[PDB]
Amino acid sequence: FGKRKGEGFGVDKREVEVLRRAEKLGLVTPGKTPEEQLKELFLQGKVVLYDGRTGEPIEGPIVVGQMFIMKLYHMVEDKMHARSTGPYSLITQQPLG
Amino acid sequence: MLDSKLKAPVFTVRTQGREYGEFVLEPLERGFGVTLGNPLRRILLSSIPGTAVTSVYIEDVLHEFSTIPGVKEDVVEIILNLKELVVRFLNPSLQTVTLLLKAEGPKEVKARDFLPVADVEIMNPDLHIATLEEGGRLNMEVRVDRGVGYVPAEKHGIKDRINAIPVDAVFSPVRRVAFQVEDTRLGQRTDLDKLTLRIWTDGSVTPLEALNQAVEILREHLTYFSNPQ
Amino acid sequence: MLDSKLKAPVFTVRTQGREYGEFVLEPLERGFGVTLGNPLRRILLSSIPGTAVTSVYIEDVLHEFSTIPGVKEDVVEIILNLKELVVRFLNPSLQTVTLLLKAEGPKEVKARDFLPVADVEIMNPDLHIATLEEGGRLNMEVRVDRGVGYVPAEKHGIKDRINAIPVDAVFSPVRRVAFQVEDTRLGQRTDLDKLTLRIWTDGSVTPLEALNQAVEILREHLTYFSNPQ
Amino acid sequence: EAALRDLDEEGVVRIGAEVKPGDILVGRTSFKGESEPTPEERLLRSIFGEKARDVKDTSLRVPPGEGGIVVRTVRLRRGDPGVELKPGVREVVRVYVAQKRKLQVGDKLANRHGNKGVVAKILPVEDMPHLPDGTPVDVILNPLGV
Amino acid sequence: ERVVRDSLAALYAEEDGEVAKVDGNRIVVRYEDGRLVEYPLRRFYRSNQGTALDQRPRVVVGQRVRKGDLLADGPASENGFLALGQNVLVAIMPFDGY
Amino acid sequence: VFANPDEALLAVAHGIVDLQDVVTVRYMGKRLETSPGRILFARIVAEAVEDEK
RNA sequence: GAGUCUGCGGCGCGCG
């Protein structure tokens, strides 16, 4: 928010609306300035986010952050198996690949 | 005009370089800053056309997972760095431009080392392509194209030279878009919107140029409501 | 045209009466149905200009919470029913029109009982205002205006007569908007948008008429980006 | 011949060649029957061209699923250096294939705490949750799983 | 840190010295006791489970290295630290049904 | 106080009433004191199956 | 006017 203040702009209609719904929720002490309010809400670990599809905010602060997440090993179990027709067992006559 | 029409969105602009560009527009009726700002944002990221490294060919390298002697970085790390190269051509006649570069020995290969091309410009000079030790022989030909969106190297599969390796296409000249709608005062009624959207660009195109293209794609789509059926 | 241009949004229309109107438009690139649908929606409910009951004055009633003898309905139920009245004036000269009506005795008061006004028309005839018993004296003056969006009776506070009671302004002739973006298949790439927006209207204007006005307000706003400063 | 391009080195597949499912990685030819030729296959051969190579195609192909680029290849022939070739085994042929696994819908990712799950949809940066400043989020986790 | 070190991912510098050559295949350092060793780097090797094992030099040419400093990063190390998967920005909210 | 059903949700969209707020609304034959949201749900079901009553 | 032959029992681990 500090660079936001210097870069030249303040709070959105969006940013204020979510704040209303937010104080009505119990996340921000009613009576404080949105600047001070957003801080209190950020400290909560939650910030204001716009839908991206509609550009309208998502009523209610939502947490966001840097979560370390790993990709898991794709076995030959992943690479899906779909079988039409094919091999068959020598003694039992059931399908096998 | 004087009354309702002179009272028109004051389009103000503040742009430094070709990367950042703030755009203020006020006054607006009720909840319009949001009605305009989001669509323009959704366009500004998905729709704007640009440039990206389409294919590469190292002279002695055959596959993407190889390593070149006298070169720290691996083919993969290098083709990766290439996707970071931002080029900017000046006219339609340049659909596919092949940049050529060859450097040897104890030198660091930066993007300014590419032999200049008449109608193409490289605003990503100091980008680090590789570190050459000794007897470091690196001669490559990196293709460049103009497109839109994201194209997996798998989707296009470019083959200038039979042993060249295709690279992932990154065509959005914009990294991020931001808009704010702050209340503005018009003598009579205090409930008003003011939309200021800040756009960032890799340099290929400018914030203003992007914004304009954006508004056009939206207008072009608004006309598609013409013939009922 | 044949290739990319003939492949143009097939604007299809399905409208029954002047209240409902479905509007399908496909194919669309990636995430455009949403880029178009939401702005149109935000316009369709706030921008479209109309007429709504701004104030009312029952002759013997002083407050909004009173009841009139010989009249089943309470002042509040009646002023409520008035918000339901849809009037349609023909020209700018009619900014504020005061409709007058007075009925007595064993009769049902419908909206067609209002004394006709030269340039104003009432498309909501059979709307039920009240049920008068015996010795039922009902003489009122209901104001009507042209505006945009929703204005709480608290926001404007109209005072023709000192004892009159303002009423909530319901200016959009459009009650509800709805849009869906379902996936559509175009031979080559499955990732596509299909935008179908359903609009409901009180009858004053039609869904198609509203949609066109909407796209215009957006277009007119897209031109406000002309002169830099 | 269209299936024999990549197979440039006589037999072996060339290095740096994109191998898609169902392409020949390595060719090989064995014999058709168990012990006898075929009476009905004898007439077909003779009609269009009797002189048809009796040898059968038993070539290492790309198994359904995926292959990538061929990066390395190994072939142990007759005069073995210091290798142990099994009996019957005339010679062996290893073919190392590599492929970049971009994250797709099938793949599964999980954080060190325990939240496990698969990717359901790859949204366009265009419309996914974005912050006041243009920076959009990368992944959106479902609260209910906590 | 410890995991990559006690495991044999990254390649560490034996004693103090300087760097001679930084190849994509080998890093021959010159220690201050007057010796110089060529440290090959498993370019691209096939793991049992089919994963890539490459050692990517993190040291530039002619660099005084401290005893026990990473010269090359293991298959999954950033900077001598253990690293699997990546740090991504994430919003913890529900979407349609995705 | 909201006359028609729709009336109630438009005010919502315009920011006058949250969905979880307690308001009065005029339905088919009653003046019911129920929140917009509750009225919205009513609609979704009533729509799912056309036999509204 | 194509069809043979191989992949079993067990063991270990991992997912659900």
Side-chain angles (χ1 to χ4, degrees):
Chain A
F1 204 65
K3 197 53 170 63
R4 255 275 255 279
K5 302 141 91 186
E7 271 157 340
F9 308 77
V11 285
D12 206 310
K13 214 87 77 258
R14 312 297 36 165
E15 289 203 86
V16 185
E17 182 102 291
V18 65
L19 261 180
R20 176 206 211 70
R21 291 190 111 308
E23 286 177 49
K24 275 167 172 184
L25 204 303
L27 289 281
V28 205
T29 52
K32 222 187 251 174
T33 127
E35 160 95 48
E36 306 276 25
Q37 311 241 58
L38 229 183
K39 197 164 185 52
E40 185 138 34
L41 219 30
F42 181 74
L43 303 164
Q44 273 234 174
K46 307 183 205 156
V47 327
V48 184
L49 219 69
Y50 306 56
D51 194 319
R53 291 189 297 192
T54 192
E56 225 117 79
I58 292 197
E59 52 195 275
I62 292 188
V63 10
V64 276
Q66 282 171 287
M67 177 180 276
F68 179 73
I69 307 189
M70 345 180 200
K71 167 216 190 311
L72 279 304
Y73 173 85
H74 259 16
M75 216 172 252
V76 194
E77 82 120 72
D78 150 278
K79 284 305 170 76
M80 46 227 282
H81 262 314
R83 167 213 210 308
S84 60
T85 329
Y88 292 131
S89 159
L90 199 66
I91 52 289
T92 65
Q93 278 291 74
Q94 313 250 316
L96 280 107
Chain B
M1 317 85 91
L2 302 162
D3 173 47
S4 194
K5 258 64 236 183
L6 176 69
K7 200 211 77 186
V10 192
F11 169 55
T12 75
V13 176
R14 291 168 311 284
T15 177
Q16 220 299 293
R18 337 199 85 178
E19 311 80 78
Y20 208 7
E22 255 143 24
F23 291 107
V24 179
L25 170 114
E26 115 282 277
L28 271 183
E29 248 314 288
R30 186 63 158 182
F32 286 7
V34 42
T35 306
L36 263 182
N38 174 232
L40 299 174
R41 175 219 163 55
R42 286 198 57 162
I43 321 287
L44 274 162
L45 282 55
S46 58
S47 334
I48 315 174
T51 61
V53 186
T54 328
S55 192
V56 188
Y57 184 56
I58 310 296
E59 281 195 349
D60 263 320
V61 178
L62 320 71
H63 40 266
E64 162 171 60
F65 329 74
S66 192
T67 171
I68 312 168
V71 200
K72 186 207 194 187
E73 32 293 303
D74 333 65
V75 179
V76 178
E77 204 163 346
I78 311 159
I79 71 93
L80 188 161
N81 251 134
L82 295 172
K83 281 213 281 170
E84 201 65 53
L85 154 63
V86 56
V87 293
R88 160 190 179 295
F89 343 120
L90 274 82
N91 174 72
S93 214
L94 306 108
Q95 294 181 43
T96 155
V97 179
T98 309
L99 274 69
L100 196 115
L101 142 123
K102 47 206 176 189
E104 308 262 324
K107 164 183 197 176
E108 303 193 58
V109 185
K110 308 272 175 163
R112 56 194 43 172
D113 275 47
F114 282 105
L115 191 55
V117 183
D119 304 359
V120 79
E121 189 191 28
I122 296 167
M123 260 91 139
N124 199 34
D126 250 278
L127 150 68
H128 173 84
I129 321 296
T131 62
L132 263 51
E133 168 192 308
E134 303 292 14
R137 311 186 173 77
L138 155 75
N139 178 310
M140 68 159 181
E141 310 96 74
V142 292
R143 171 79 105 49
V144 190
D145 287 72
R146 194 180 184 189
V148 190
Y150 173 90
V151 183
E154 304 62 39
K155 223 184 173 182
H156 47 237
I158 312 299
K159 287 303 177 168
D160 282 346
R161 188 133 310 87
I162 43 171
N163 262 185
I165 70 153
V167 198
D168 308 348
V170 286
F171 296 126
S172 173
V174 169
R175 194 241 146 56
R176 38 179 169 176
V177 166
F179 74 88
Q180 266 230 170
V181 190
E182 67 177 346
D183 342 290
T184 161
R185 68 157 191 206
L186 192 106
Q188 73 172 294
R189 209 57 128 76
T190 320
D191 33 309
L192 279 181
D193 299 75
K194 186 175 187 186
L195 180 75
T196 74
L197 83 158
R198 25 174 60 157
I199 296 86
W200 277 287
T201 31
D202 71 344
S204 201
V205 312
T206 238
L208 199 131
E209 313 227 289
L211 176 62
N212 306 172
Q213 277 162 61
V215 182
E216 267 288 1
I217 302 142
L218 192 62
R219 234 245 251 185
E220 257 196 82
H221 291 325
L222 266 47
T223 200
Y224 286 131
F225 272 145
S226 216
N227 46 276
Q229 195 134 191
Chain C
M1 221 36 62
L2 72 101
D3 246 44
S4 186
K5 210 108 258 194
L6 201 59
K7 176 277 182 70
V10 183
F11 188 48
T12 82
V13 190
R14 306 200 273 309
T15 193
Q16 314 307 167
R18 311 172 70 213
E19 280 72 10
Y20 198 174
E22 301 260 26
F23 305 108
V24 176
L25 158 130
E26 88 282 321
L28 332 180
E29 282 205 298
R30 199 90 166 296
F32 276 104
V34 199
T35 291
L36 315 162
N38 182 245
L40 292 153
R41 157 198 168 70
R42 289 195 58 47
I43 303 297
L44 299 178
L45 276 198
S46 179
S47 190
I48 299 184
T51 70
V53 189
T54 329
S55 268
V56 187
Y57 180 41
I58 276 284
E59 283 319 308
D60 56 76
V61 165
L62 17 69
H63 305 294
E64 192 194 318
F65 314 68
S66 323
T67 178
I68 309 172
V71 193
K72 174 187 159 65
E73 0 286 34
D74 195 50
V75 171
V76 200
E77 147 77 81
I78 302 161
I79 64 180
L80 216 51
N81 227 96
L82 312 194
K83 301 218 215 98
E84 175 102 80
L85 180 70
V86 61
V87 301
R88 197 181 170 187
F89 338 134
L90 173 68
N91 48 70
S93 325
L94 295 183
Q95 310 108 195
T96 175
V97 171
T98 289
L99 261 63
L100 322 159
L101 180 155
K102 186 170 183 287
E104 268 112 275
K107 62 188 281 197
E108 294 184 79
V109 201
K110 286 194 184 182
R112 43 217 311 205
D113 185 61
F114 283 87
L115 73 72
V117 210
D119 317 66
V120 180
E121 187 231 323
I122 292 185
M123 22 230 306
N124 228 315
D126 327 285
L127 201 54
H128 198 280
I129 328 300
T131 55
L132 263 56
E133 180 63 7
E134 311 282 345
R137 190 274 182 167
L138 180 137
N139 182 53
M140 59 219 305
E141 27 222 54
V142 294
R143 186 161 167 174
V144 185
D145 288 64
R146 57 178 61 193
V148 287
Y150 197 103
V151 197
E154 178 148 1
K155 220 86 178 179
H156 48 73
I158 286 299
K159 57 235 91 65
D160 276 3
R161 260 60 191 79
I162 64 95
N163 14 28
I165 49 176
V167 214
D168 311 329
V170 289
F171 290 118
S172 205
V174 201
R175 350 289 307 150
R176 32 161 135 154
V177 285
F179 69 141
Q180 310 194 164
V181 176
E182 314 90 291
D183 294 3
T184 159
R185 208 181 97 185
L186 207 127
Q188 280 198 30
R189 39 177 280 190
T190 326
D191 46 61
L192 279 147
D193 300 61
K194 182 224 282 286
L195 176 59
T196 78
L197 146 159
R198 28 200 239 155
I199 304 169
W200 285 273
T201 342
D202 73 321
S204 192
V205 298
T206 226
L208 196 68
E209 278 110 64
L211 201 54
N212 267 65
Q213 256 53 52
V215 315
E216 143 49 18
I217 274 71
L218 214 87
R219 207 213 50 176
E220 201 190 322
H221 280 52
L222 291 186
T223 282
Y224 274 132
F225 296 132
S226 44
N227 302 258
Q229 264 174 66
Chain D
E1 185 63 51
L4 275 55
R5 321 187 193 283
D6 311 346
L7 203 172
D8 221 46
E9 347 268 287
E10 267 90 322
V12 183
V13 55
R14 71 185 260 231
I15 280 69
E18 154 218 307
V19 283
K20 251 51 180 176
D23 272 329
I24 308 228
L25 267 167
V26 173
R28 172 177 70 88
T29 45
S30 68
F31 285 67
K32 236 58 195 181
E34 305 290 277
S35 23
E36 41 68 77
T38 318
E40 324 258 62
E41 175 192 21
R42 179 73 41 157
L43 292 177
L44 169 64
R45 284 301 195 180
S46 291
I47 296 177
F48 290 45
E50 50 127 10
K51 41 163 54 46
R53 232 174 52 151
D54 237 288
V55 91
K56 179 173 244 242
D57 165 273
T58 54
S59 312
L60 165 78
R61 286 185 182 296
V62 195
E66 260 250 337
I69 322 279
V70 203
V71 285
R72 169 185 151 183
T73 27
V74 194
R75 205 239 256 69
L76 317 181
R77 358 188 185 168
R78 294 201 171 198
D80 294 292
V83 65
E84 30 200 67
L85 230 63
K86 319 163 181 56
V89 185
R90 187 204 193 203
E91 62 184 326
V92 305
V93 162
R94 257 176 310 274
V95 192
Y96 291 44
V97 154
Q99 63 194 69
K100 257 213 234 162
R101 301 233 168 164
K102 296 177 193 182
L103 195 51
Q104 62 163 167
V105 79
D107 303 37
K108 73 178 70 179
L109 0 162
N111 63 183
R112 288 160 316 177
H113 293 271
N115 196 324
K116 198 155 178 301
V118 197
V119 156
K121 188 140 174 287
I122 325 141
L123 275 45
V125 57
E126 336 175 344
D127 56 359
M128 79 162 37
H130 75 265
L131 190 151
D133 122 52
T135 170
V137 299
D138 303 88
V139 55
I140 356 182
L141 293 183
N142 183 60
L144 292 155
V146 181
Chain E
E1 305 183 283
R2 279 284 221 146
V3 182
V4 309
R5 204 158 245 179
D6 266 288
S7 95
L8 274 174
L11 211 83
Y12 299 83
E14 295 179 6
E15 211 91 38
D16 283 301
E18 209 122 291
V19 196
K21 317 172 180 199
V22 241
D23 198 287
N25 232 203
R26 36 168 176 64
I27 355 172
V28 191
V29 252
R30 163 199 34 198
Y31 292 142
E32 283 291 41
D33 32 41
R35 344 171 248 139
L36 47 110
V37 221
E38 182 167 88
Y39 285 166
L41 319 178
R42 292 207 297 189
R43 35 171 40 187
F44 282 116
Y45 284 69
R46 168 63 148 66
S47 108
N48 243 13
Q49 306 319 286
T51 6
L53 322 165
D54 38 281
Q55 310 179 63
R56 311 141 151 291
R58 266 285 299 207
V59 187
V60 306
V61 234
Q63 190 178 306
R64 349 204 191 186
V65 295
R66 76 174 59 176
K67 165 183 179 144
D69 195 316
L70 52 162
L71 310 166
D73 266 85
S77 57
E78 198 195 74
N79 306 308
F81 296 148
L82 182 50
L84 346 86
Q86 332 227 5
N87 298 154
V88 305
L89 207 167
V90 50
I92 176 211
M93 52 170 262
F95 223 57
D96 257 67
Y98 301 118
Chain F
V1 220
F2 298 111
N4 211 40
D6 293 42
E7 285 277 316
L9 292 80
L10 311 175
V12 188
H14 263 257
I16 275 301
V17 292
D18 294 20
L19 280 175
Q20 307 100 42
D21 245 351
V22 235
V23 219
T24 56
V25 176
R26 207 247 299 155
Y27 210 79
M28 295 189 148
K30 291 183 64 193
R31 296 211 222 181
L32 298 177
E33 314 174 7
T34 294
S35 87
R38 292 274 225 312
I39 213 295
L40 163 43
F41 179 47
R43 191 246 279 197
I44 312 164
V45 202
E47 268 205 69
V49 275
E50 180 64 77
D51 239 55
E52 174 156 54
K53 318 232 66 190

